[PDB]
Design a protein around this ligand. Structure first.
Ligand code: RET
Length: 133
């Protein structure tokens, strides 16, 4: 299934610190960030996605259209410009963010009622698993 619609709650998070460090997120932010529960809310209609990740202190929101490149400013995540593209590889949603950082982007896919999110930057891979609310 490509259907990633829904409200998802984090259950797992391997190497979050290392991924944030790869983006040069400041020590004080990471120290608090590693403690927080995350909710991920996805609205998916055809190619049009609206993605919202929320926690007690910070959010990250992005809209995109599958198959359409977009010049993106990463806004308070890490304040960098990237050329972003989100496409399908089978039932895996693959984002590549071309810019300063190598191997930067993410992959989302569904297994049963769990959503898997691999976040990549440099040589760091962060793996998150969400369960559907
Ligand atoms: C497809 C799902 C994506 C692209 C989710 C991205 C999520 C983030 C960039 C999360 C960022 C953070 C928070 C929500 C608070 C904890 C600290 C951050 C900045 C890593």
């Amino acid at each position: 299934t490509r259907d990633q619609n829904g409200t998802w709650e984090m259950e797992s998070n391997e190497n979050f610190e290392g991924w944030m460090k790869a983006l040069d997120i400041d020590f004080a932010t990471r120290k608090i960030a590693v403690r927080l529960t995350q909710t991920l809310v996805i609205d998916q209609d055809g190619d049009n996605f609206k993605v919202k990740t929320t926690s007690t202190f910070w959010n990250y929101d992005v809209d995109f259209t599958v198959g359409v490149e977009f010049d993106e400013y990463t806004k308070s995540l890490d304040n960098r410009h990237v050329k972003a593209l989100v496409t399908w590889e089978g039932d895996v949603l693959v984002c590549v963010q071309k810019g300063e950082k190598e191997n930067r982007g993410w992959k989302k896919w569904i297994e049963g009622d769990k959503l898997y999110l691999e976040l990549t930057c440099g040589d760091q891979v962060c793996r998150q698993v969400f369960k559907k609310k």
